[PDB]
Write an enzyme that holds these catalytic residues in place. Structure first.
Site, PDB file in Angstrom:
ATOM      1  N   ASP A 124      83.338 -11.374  15.672  1.00  0.00           N
ATOM      2  CA  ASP A 124      82.183 -10.551  15.328  1.00  0.00           C
ATOM      3  C   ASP A 124      81.106 -10.652  16.406  1.00  0.00           C
ATOM      4  O   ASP A 124      79.915 -10.802  16.109  1.00  0.00           O
ATOM      5  CB  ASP A 124      81.609 -10.927  13.967  1.00  0.00           C
ATOM      6  CG  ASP A 124      80.784  -9.815  13.375  1.00  0.00           C
ATOM      7  OD1 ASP A 124      80.869  -8.678  13.894  1.00  0.00           O
ATOM      8  OD2 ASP A 124      80.045 -10.075  12.404  1.00  0.00           O
TER       9      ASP A 124
ATOM     10  N   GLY B 265      71.978 -15.911   1.576  1.00  0.00           N
ATOM     11  CA  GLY B 265      71.050 -16.990   1.811  1.00  0.00           C
ATOM     12  C   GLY B 265      69.648 -16.538   2.102  1.00  0.00           C
ATOM     13  O   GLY B 265      69.391 -15.364   2.296  1.00  0.00           O
ATOM     14  N   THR B 266      68.730 -17.484   2.108  1.00  0.00           N
ATOM     15  CA  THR B 266      67.411 -17.243   2.627  1.00  0.00           C
ATOM     16  C   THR B 266      67.148 -18.265   3.712  1.00  0.00           C
ATOM     17  O   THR B 266      67.476 -19.421   3.556  1.00  0.00           O
ATOM     18  CB  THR B 266      66.381 -17.387   1.534  1.00  0.00           C
ATOM     19  OG1 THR B 266      65.503 -18.456   1.873  1.00  0.00           O
ATOM     20  CG2 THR B 266      67.075 -17.705   0.250  1.00  0.00           C
TER      21      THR B 266
ATOM     22  N   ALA C 109      71.576 -11.777   0.611  1.00  0.00           N
ATOM     23  CA  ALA C 109      72.140 -12.101  -0.678  1.00  0.00           C
ATOM     24  C   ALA C 109      72.763 -13.470  -0.542  1.00  0.00           C
ATOM     25  O   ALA C 109      72.632 -14.315  -1.428  1.00  0.00           O
ATOM     26  CB  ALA C 109      73.188 -11.078  -1.076  1.00  0.00           C
TER      27      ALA C 109
ATOM     28  N   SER D   5      65.841 -12.948   4.125  1.00  0.00           N
ATOM     29  CA  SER D   5      66.377 -13.089   2.791  1.00  0.00           C
ATOM     30  C   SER D   5      67.617 -12.260   2.777  1.00  0.00           C
ATOM     31  O   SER D   5      67.583 -11.096   3.126  1.00  0.00           O
ATOM     32  CB  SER D   5      65.412 -12.529   1.766  1.00  0.00           C
ATOM     33  OG  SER D   5      64.358 -13.430   1.515  1.00  0.00           O
TER      34      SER D   5
END
Ligand code: C6O
Length: 283
Positions: free
Chosen positions: A134, A29-30, A27, A25
């Site tokens: 990244d 997405g889940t 912020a 979970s």
């Protein structure tokens, strides 16, 4: 100047996949562990399903354009009221956690082979004129302990301790600035998950690298391996190695793993009838 991107973006019906369990979970997405059954195809494909938009569609755009054994791939998307991305499930989680959890059981053959595969996937991205920006052990996923993939092209086209000096100073990013983070990533694996520059303010990192300081030689690392890390962290970016060279160098060493990494004890470490891995499901 570029060739036309003829990637296919697959739209899927929501009745074609079911979400078994939750994985994360965030912020943003889940994400669900789930299963994808193409309609009347008699296959069940283990997937990761992401629920949250120009961000999520930019991400989908990039992932649909990459095809490599060591890069994550998008299977499709669903234009549900909440947009959903359907990707290949990587059962063993992310490599950083994996390496921390199982350090007492990771040999030098495994470590060196991971370095080869990340180098392969990064060399592929370079072929595709794509820059990751990244790369880190937290963004390599584990399909099997023998097979990892590069993930999270959120920034593809901020993590200062993984970042090349040019990037910290002038916001420049190159395939060669990716090589730097590859070196920092390799350092994360060889230290079995330690955090780089732990207990140091990010604000200081730029000055420290300018002074000529870098990350320490990990205890298991022969100078042969550590030399390769050190070259990935030169200021002059044409001095750093190419990913295709990193492939060759780590492949050589993967022939005689014990010669390059010295690890204590290293020597000796309901209906699923139709499930197929996404890597063998082609259209
Ligand atoms: C950085 C790792 C990370 O924490 N998370 C958040 C949740 C899952 C996320 N996750 C994606 O974000 C993505 C992704 C990347 C880009 C675009 C996109 F649409 C997606 Cl879906 C993919 C492909 C993905 C594939 N496989 C998987 N397996 C997976 C994850 C976590 C675990 N846990 C749970 C149990 N233990 C508590 C610890 C380990 C396990 C066992 C397997 N996780 C995936 C990433």
């Amino acid at each position: 100047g570029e060739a036309p991107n003829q990637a296919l973006l697959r739209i899927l019906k929501e009745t074609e996949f079911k979400k078994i369990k939750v994985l994360g979970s965030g912020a943003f997405g889940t994400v669900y562990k789930g299963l994808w059954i193409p309609e009347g195809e008699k296959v069940k494909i283990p997937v990761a399903i992401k629920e949250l938009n120009k961000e999520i569609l930019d991400e989908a755009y990039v992932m649909a354009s990459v095809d490599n054994p060591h890069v994550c791939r998008l299977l499709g998307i669903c234009l549900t009221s909440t947009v959903q991305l359907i990707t290949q499930l990587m059962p063993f989680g992310c490599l950083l956690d994996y390496v921390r959890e199982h350090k007492d059981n990771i040999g030098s053959q495994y470590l060196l082979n991971w370095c080869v595969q990340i180098a392969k996937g990064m060399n592929y991205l370079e072929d595709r004129r794509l820059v990751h920006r990244d790369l880190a052990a937290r963004n390599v996923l584990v399909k099997t302990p023998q097979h990892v993939k590069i993930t999270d092209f959120g920034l593809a086209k901020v993590p200062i301790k993984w970042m090349a000096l040019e990037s910290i100073l002038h916001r420049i990013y190159t395939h060669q600035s990716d090589v730097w983070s590859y070196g920092v990533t390799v350092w994360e694996l060889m230290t079995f998950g330690s955090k780089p520059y732990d207990g140091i303010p990010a604000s200081e990192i730029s000055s420290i690298l300018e002074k000529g300081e870098r990350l320490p030689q990990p205890p298991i690392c022969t100078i042969d391996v550590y030399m390769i890390m050190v070259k990935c962290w030169m200021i002059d970016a044409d001095s750093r190695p190419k990913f295709r060279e990193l492939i060759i160098e780590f492949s050589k060493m993967a022939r005689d793993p014990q010669r390059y990494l010295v690890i204590q004890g290293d020597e000796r470490m309901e209906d699923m009838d139709d499930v197929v891995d996404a890597d063998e499901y082609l259209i």
